[model samples]
Structures are given as C-alpha cells and as structure tokens.
Target: SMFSRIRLATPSDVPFIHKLIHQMAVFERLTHLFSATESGLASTLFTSRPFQSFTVFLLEVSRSPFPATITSSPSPDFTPFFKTHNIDDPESYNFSPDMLNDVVVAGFVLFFPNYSSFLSKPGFYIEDIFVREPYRRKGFGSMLLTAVAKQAVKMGYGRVEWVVLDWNVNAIKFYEQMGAQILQEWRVCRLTGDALEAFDQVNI
Candidate 1:
C-alpha cells in the first residue's frame, strides 16, 4: 500500500483544490456548468465568521518512494472561537499544509454543515469528493469519504449525505459498498440563472 496522509486544507491549498474541483466537474461531464474562482473559494472557505461553516480535507501521497513527512510541531490550542464551534481538536482548525510540499495531493473532500431539525442536530453534507484518475481504485475514495464520516460521528451528527449522478454506476456502486443508501424517491431541485434572479423582483 502507498503511504498517504489526510489533513485539513488551508487557504494555501486553494490552487490545488481549485484544480481538483475542475477535474471533478470534467469527470461528471458538467464542466460547462462550473463557475467557481480561486479567490471566491479562499474567502468563503477560510473565513471563520460563520464559525468555520465549511471544511475541506486533502489526501496527499508522496511523489518519492519515501513515506509522506508529517509536520512535527503541534499547533497551539488557543481560541474560544474554536471551542464554541464544536472544534474540540485545535489542530483540526489550524494546521500548516506547507510541510508536505513534496507530496502530490491525490484528492479532496469538500463538505459543510446541514441542520437536521427533526433530529435536533447538525449533519454533514458532502458537496464533492474526487480523486485523480491516477489515484483511483487505490482505496483513496473510501479513505476520503471515511474521513468525513469519522468527523460526523465524533460530532454526534445524524448523518452524512451527498447526491450522485444516476448515470455514474461506478460511483453509485462504490458508495453503496460503503453502506450508503441511494434514495430513489427524491430528486435534486435547483433554481439557477433567471429563475433565481426572478426572486429579487418580488415584493416582501
């Protein structure tokens, strides 16, 4: 098995994250619908105002034969902001990704919190999870998905959910193998462009 490490992504990873996102869109055959920018991701992701609303985790593998190097120094646990936000592990919110610059980021998982009113708890909603073509079938996808599930469990979240394209049988099977249920009764609804803009014209 190849040596790999999964860690929380920082603002410094915007470029790599942005590139992976585009690759993911291409894989889904939805490249033309993509409209995200590096600057926008950095601002929305790294900002703590909403108490670290969204999160990203990067899985990296060493380009060399050696094992991936881990940053030795531990970060200081110094902030009430983190405590209030259910961030029990200080390093979970603050860690430098620069230490493993020699490694290649094989994949990433982008997720955010979703409230479950019936359960009276927050749930993890994975927006995207992608591994590079070269890194596929190496269990990297499961590892990335597992990371989010572990976090959700530790936080006492109700569930972790994400939508998969119907045509993507491979991905659908992969998810199913992990005990994820494919909800056939529900369809994803969206309002984009003119439909979304039309809301502004309506009076309160």
Candidate 2:
C-alpha cells in the first residue's frame, strides 16, 4: 500500500485529467472512439451546474515501490484492468488518461446519477477509474475505490456499482477478488440518433 490521498478534483486539474483519459483510451485500443475534447471534459466534469453530479476523485500516490517496478517495462498484453481493447479492431487504439492529461501521482473517480432500479437507492455510479501507467501496481486504484464507497455510504446509498467490459478478464478477476458479485444476467443496451430522441419522448 502507498501513502495515497484521495481528494476532489478542481478545474485546474482538467488538463491533466484529460491526459489520464487519453491514456486509458490508448490502452483500450479505442482512441478513435473518444469524442471528448479537453474543454468538453472540463465543462462536463468541473462545471458547477445543476443535475450534473459529476465528481472526480484524485489519488495522490506517495512512497510506493510497486509502481517503480511496473514502470520499468511497458507491456501491451498487460490486460488493462481499467479499460478495453476490441478484438475486431486491434489497430483502433484508445488513449488512456496518461496520454491526454499530465499529472504525477494522480488518478480519478467520476460519479454519475443512477440510471436503473437497483441504482435508485441514492447511490452514485462510478463512471471512470484510472491511474497513470507509472503509477500502477500500487494501491491507488483500491484507495480511490474505498474513497468512493465511503462517500456513497455517507450519502445513504444502499449500493455503488459500475460496469466493466466483459473482455477485461483482469478487471473481472480483480472485482471478484474484492468480493463484488458479477451481474451475469444483465446486458447493457443503448439507443442513439433518432431512436434515442424517440425513446426520450416516450411517456411511462
């Protein structure tokens, strides 16, 4: 475990935060799919607007030996625990936060409002979790997660949840090891363009 400190991100952290996101994309091999610009990210995550409960937590690492060893060798086959790489389009690389933003000893956790029945209990959704390449292998990820859990509990949330790509075996294992149960019966679906608009207009 490292001497990690978790805190809320400010507007000043937007640039470095963006780099972290790009690094995640690159690791996932889906950089082209990223439509978020630095300014856009800043507006979405840092703006103090209503209905935007987006909160980012930064983990500042201190005195961690694990990261030092891991950074010595870069591996594409490391099975990124936080992102995904599609099999069909291997060349379509995604950037992780490490590339898009620049920040040392830093990581983030984004919270979103619930979108499902199970998540209706005042819980927050973990939209993203990432640590820089050189900052991995340390306990930064777990520390960040713990901070989120504490916050959720403080808010009277019954549960906190997030989705992981099915292809990410490493992440799956880590989640399981952490005593988290997988919702195998659930499959996420999305609607876009006109279909999305039509769906939005539907009355319950």
Candidate 3:
C-alpha cells in the first residue's frame, strides 16, 4: 500500500501544477515560448464554467526508492469511481490541501476535450504530461497515461490523442510502445502574435 497513487488536482494544487508545467517546458527545450502563469492556470482550469475547460491529475509516489516497474499492470480502472462521482459535476472532484501533505509529487497530466464530428463524440487531447527527471523509467508515465485512458472510457470519449515533437525520439518510442500510432500525414498548425493580430484585422 506504499507505492504510488494518482489524484485529481483541486484549486489548492495550482502551485504544484504551475511548477511542473514550467519544468515540462524546460525538458521540451521550449522555455522561450513558455508564458503560463499560476494565476492564468487558476482562471482557466478552476474558475471556468461548465466544469472547467481542462483537468489536471497529479501522481504521487513515496519518498523511498521507487521500483523501475510496477508489480502489476499499470492500467487504471475508473468505472467504480465514475459511479460515485459524476464527471459533469465540479463539486464531485473537490478536495482539501491537508490530503496532500505526505506523498511526493512525481508527475502530472493535463488534458481537455475535443469533439470528433464523424463519431459525434468528444475525445481527450492531452496537452502535457511530464514526469520528474529522477522518476523517469519508473512506469509513472504509463500510469499517468492509463489514468487518462480510464477517464476517457468512463466519459465515453471516442479516442485519446496528443502530439509529440518529431525530435523527441525517446518520447516517440515510448508512445509507440504504448500502442499509439504516429500519424505521418497530419501536421500541426498554429498562428500567434503578429500573425494572429493580422488575421484578426484581415479584410477577407
């Protein structure tokens, strides 16, 4: 009973989430584009209506030396959990800060929903998932991913999708090992700063 556990983050955990998100940016070599703030996260993740725009889950492991792999399968089963806490209700996931006093925060995953028109269902878009440097290769990444998958199933999502940088060879291999198919045909497109402003003022 003294290994690792995953829990949904409440407003009280914004500081932890913010720090981890920054660390994740550092790991990705994208610090120049990093502009997320603690207050910004709170406003978007916790204060938004309709059950908030996104959700965050934290993984906590004991301070003792963690095993490289889990004893059993790392997949999470959330059917029973869904039965007690309705996913549509914000109050269902509330928690107190006192509950997080012990275990070490090893990693986190943040995700939001995206609608699939063909399936007429919403699927999850995992924005960021990061494990601390010391906790790498400990099956914690799979555990975090499994937690998201279980929640998606419980919520009746069509699929779970996320993008990885092409240069991140290790992450690509890890995702492939976890049964993810790399979509070579699709490309991500984003416009920000000047382009975004120009688009807003376009005549066409």
My TM-score estimates for the predictions, one after another, are 0.76, 0.66, 0.74
What are the lDDT figures for the candidates, one per model?
0.70, 0.61, 0.69
Model 3 backbone overlap count: 0
Arranged by TM-score, best first: 1, 3, 2
Please state the error at residue 86 of candidate 1 in Å.
36
Query: How does candidate 2 fare on TM-score?
Result: 0.66
Model 3 clash pairs?
none
Stretches of candidate 3 exceeding 4 Å from the true structure:
48-52, 63-100, 167-173
By lDDT: ranked, best first:
1, 3, 2
lDDT tens per residue, model 2, 1-204: 334455556666677677778878887898997777778987677555312477776665433222322332122212112211110212112322253332243567777656446655556688888876666666667767777777666556677789988898998998899888889999988878798789767788
Error of 3 at 97 (Å): 5.1
Model 1, 118-179: lDDT tens per residue? 98988889988898766776777778888888777766788999998899999899889889
Give the range where candidate 1 is weakest over 10 consecutive residues by summed lDDT.
78-87
TM-score of 3: 0.74
* TM value for model 1: 0.76
Error of 1 at 129 (Å): 0.8
* TM-score top scorer: 1
